[PDB]
Write a protein that binds this ligand. Structure first.
Ligand SMILES: [Mn+2]
Ligand SMILES: [Mn+2]
Ligand SMILES: [Mn+2]
Ligand SMILES: [Mn+2]
Lengths: 362, 362
C-alpha cells in the first residue's frame, strides 16, 4: 500500500475533499523532498480521486519537478496571494480539508477559508502517526546512519572526559557537537546530556560548566539527525575506579537492558518487553528508582510510537523501532541509564548503536 | 508607556475581550521570561480592565513568579486539559480573543473554542511588530552583547581559515559555532555562511566540505542569539594575496557600506539609505550585480523591520535597528558583502559590530 494511496483511502472513507499538508517533516516523509518554505507557503494536496498536487514557492518548482514523481507541481510568485493560486488550481468542490492540527497556524487556515469558504477541517495527524509506526528498509537504513554517528559521539565523549584537566560537562557536550558539525550533521536530535555522579539521578538534569567528578560514573545521552531520521542512545562509563555500589547499579541496569534486547521479537507485547527489564530491576531491589517507561518509538522524531510501557498490550511487529532504556536513579547517590534504539526484524531485533555496554573505566 | 498598557489600549479600541499570546519570543518581549514550553501550553492574557494573567506549564510557574511582578500566574498539570484550566480561571465572559495569527496552530484555537464557545479571533501581530520597530536602551544594550559575540566569531573564523592545511568552509563554520557554544552561546541567529571564491557569488551558496581557495576572497556571514536578541554581520577577507579585480570589488563595496553608515540619521528615508549605497555601486559599474535590498530590520529576529529597500519612503527614526549590507556578486568570479547592523541615535547611528572592514590578508 503506497502512503499516498493510504491517505486517499482515508479521504474517501471520511468523505473529506482534500489534504493541505504543511509540516516540512511530513512533506519529506510523503514526497522525499526536504522543502524548507520558511514562512513562505507550501502544501501537499491529496484528493479522493485525482492527481496529488504539490504547491511550493516559485523558486522551488524547478527542483521539485526533478526530485519528485507522480505529483502535479505548481508555484506562486511573492507578488501573488498563495491561497488565491491554490484556489485557482483546485477547481471544485471543497468543503472539507484534512490538515495537521498541531502544525498549521491560523493565518493558513484563514487563508484557505478566504478562498474556499466555510470549510470543515479534519485532523490528518493521527493517520500520519499510524503510518510512521512501521519503518521501511529505506528508513531503517537512514536510522542506521544516525546510529553510527551516535556511536562516534560516545567515542569522542569518553576520550574528552578522560583528558580531565578541569574538563566540564558542557565542555564535553561542545566537543561532541563540534565533531558532528564537522561531519555534516545538521543538528543533534535532542539536547546532549553529560551528567556526572549523582547529577545523573536528576530526571531534569542538564549539563553545566561543572568539573566531572573523579571516581564517579558519567552518563552520556545523545543522538543526531541525519537524512531526516533520528538516533538516541545512552551509555554510562566510569571516570577512574568507581565504588562497589555504583558498579553494581550499572551491572543491574546493563543486565536488564540486555535481557529486554534478547527478548524482543514479533509476537511479544509492549507490556511484556517493559516487564522483562522492570522485573529484573525490581527483583534486584531498585524498582522504586526505575521511574519511567522502558521505551519510546523513534523515527523522524525522537518520540513517536510505540510506547513500551505497562498496560500496552500492543503486539510487537517487524519494522517497529523503539528505545530500550532502563535506568536506576537514586537521588544524591548515583544514576545509571543504558539505552539503545532498535528495529524489530522477522525473528528478533537489531540495535542501531553498537558501543560497548560494559562499565568502562576512563 | 508600559507595553502591557499599550496592548490593553488596543483591546479597548478594537472591542476585544482579551489576548492569548503564544509565541515564546513575544512572551519574552512582554514579560522578560524565556519560557520554552515546547509542546506544552503557555499564554499571556491581557484584558481591557483587569489584572493580566500568565498561564504556564506547572513546572514553569515557580520561575515565572520569581522574575515577574504584576502578572497573575497559574499553571496546569500534564494530567489536566489546559484549555479547561484557562476557562476556569477567567471569570469575565469572553467572545473575542487577540492572538498571533502566524504562530497559533489549529489545535490551540480549537482548544480555546471548545471551552469558550464561538470566539472571534483578532490578529495582534501588527501591533507587536509596531512595538518592536523602536528599541529601548535596554534592548540596544542586549543587541550590543550579541554583536560583540559576532565580532569574536570573526576573529575565530579568520584564524581558523589562516591555518590552511586542508581546512574547509564547513570546518570553519564548525569551529566558530564550537567556540560560541563554549562561551554559553548555544545558537546562532541564522545558518553561518563561509563561502570561498566564486562560491560567494551564489545567492543560495551554503558552506560545504570543500577546501578554501588560495588567492581568492572568503565571505563570512554570521550572528548569534544572546539574551533573546540577534546579531548579524558580514566580512570578506583574502586568503593569501588577492587579485586586483577582486580587491577593487571589495573596495567598492566597502566604500558604499561606509557611505550609507555616514548618511544614516533620523529624518532620512529607507529608500534614501538604500540609494546611497546603490548609487555608488551603480556609478562604479556594478549595479546589475547588487541584486538585493540594502538592509532589513533586526531585533529579537534577524528578519524584522524596517525594510531598507527602494520604494519604502518610511522615515527613519531614533531607536530603529537594521542592517547595512551592500554586495557585489559576479557569477563564477567573486562575491563580496560587508555588513553591520546599526541602531539609529538622536543625530546619527552606531554599529553593533566593530571588526575591521578592510580587505585583510590571512
Ligand atoms: Mn536518550
Ligand atoms: Mn530515549
Ligand atoms: Mn548577514
Ligand atoms: Mn542581514
Amino acid at each position: 500500500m503506497s502512503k499516498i494511496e493510504r491517505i486517499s483511502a482515508f479521504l474517501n472513507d471520511k468523505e473529506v475533499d482534500m489534504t493541505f499538508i504543511t509540516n516540512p517533516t511530513t512533506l519529506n516523509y510523503l514526497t522525499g523532498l526536504a522543502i524548507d518554505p520558511s514562512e513562505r507557503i507550501a502544501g501537499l494536496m491529496i484528493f479522493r480521486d485525482s492527481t496529488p498536487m504539490l504547491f511550493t514557492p516559485a523558486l522551488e518548482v524547478e527542483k521539485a519537478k526533478e526530485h519528485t514523481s507522480g505529483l502535479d507541481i505548481f508555484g506562486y510568485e511573492d507578488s501573488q496571494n498563495p491561497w488565491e493560486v491554490v484556489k485557482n488550481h483546485v477547481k471544485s468542490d471543497v468543503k472539507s480539508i484534512a490538515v495537521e492540527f498541531s502544525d498549521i497556524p491560523l493565518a493558513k487556515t484563514e487563508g484557505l477559508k478566504a478562498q474556499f469558504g466555510d470549510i470543515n477541517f479534519v485532523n490528518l495527524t493521527p493517520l500520519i502517526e499510524r503510518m510512521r509506526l512501521i519503518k521501511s528498509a529505506d528508513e531503517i537504513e537512514k536510522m542506521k546512519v544516525a546510529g553510527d554517528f551516535a556511536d562516534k559521539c560516545f567515542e569522542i565523549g569518553f576520550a574528552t572526559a578522560a583528558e580531565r584537566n578541569g574538563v566540564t560537562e558542557s565542555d564535553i557536550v561542545a566537543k561532541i557537537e563540534y565533531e558532528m558539525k564537522r561531519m555534516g550533521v545538521p543538528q543533534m536530535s535532542f539536547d546532549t546530556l553529560v551528567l556526572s555522579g549523582a547529577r545523573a539521578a536528576n530526571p531534569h538534569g542538564a549539563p553545566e560548566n561543572v568539573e566531572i567528578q573523579e571516581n564517579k560514573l558519567l552518563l552520556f545521552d545523545l543522538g543526531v539527525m541525519s537524512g531526516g531520521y533520528a538516533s538516541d542512545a545512552t551509555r554510562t562509563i566510569a571516570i577512574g575506579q568507581p565504588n562497589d555500589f555504583d558498579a553494581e547499579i550499572h551491572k543491574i541496569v546493563k543486565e536488564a537492558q540486555q535481557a529486554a534486547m534478547d527478548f524482543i521479537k514479533p509476537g511479544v507485547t509492549a507490556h511484556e518487553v517493559d516487564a522483562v527489564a522492570r522485573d529484573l530491576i525490581t527483583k534486584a531491589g531498585y524498582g522504586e528508582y526505575f521511574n519511567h517507561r522502558l521505551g519510546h518509538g523513534i523515527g523522524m522524531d525522537v518520540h513517536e510510537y510505540p510506547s513500551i510501557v505497562a498496560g500496552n498490550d500492543l503486539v510487537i511487529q517487524e519494522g517497529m523501532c523503539f528505545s530500550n532504556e532502563p535506568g536506576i536513579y537514586i537521588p544524591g547517590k548515583v544514576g545509571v541509564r543504558i539505552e539503545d534504539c532498535l528495529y524489530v526484524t522477522e525473528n528478533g531485533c537489531e540495535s542501531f548503536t553498537h558501543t560497548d555496554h560494559d562499565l568502562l573505566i576512563f
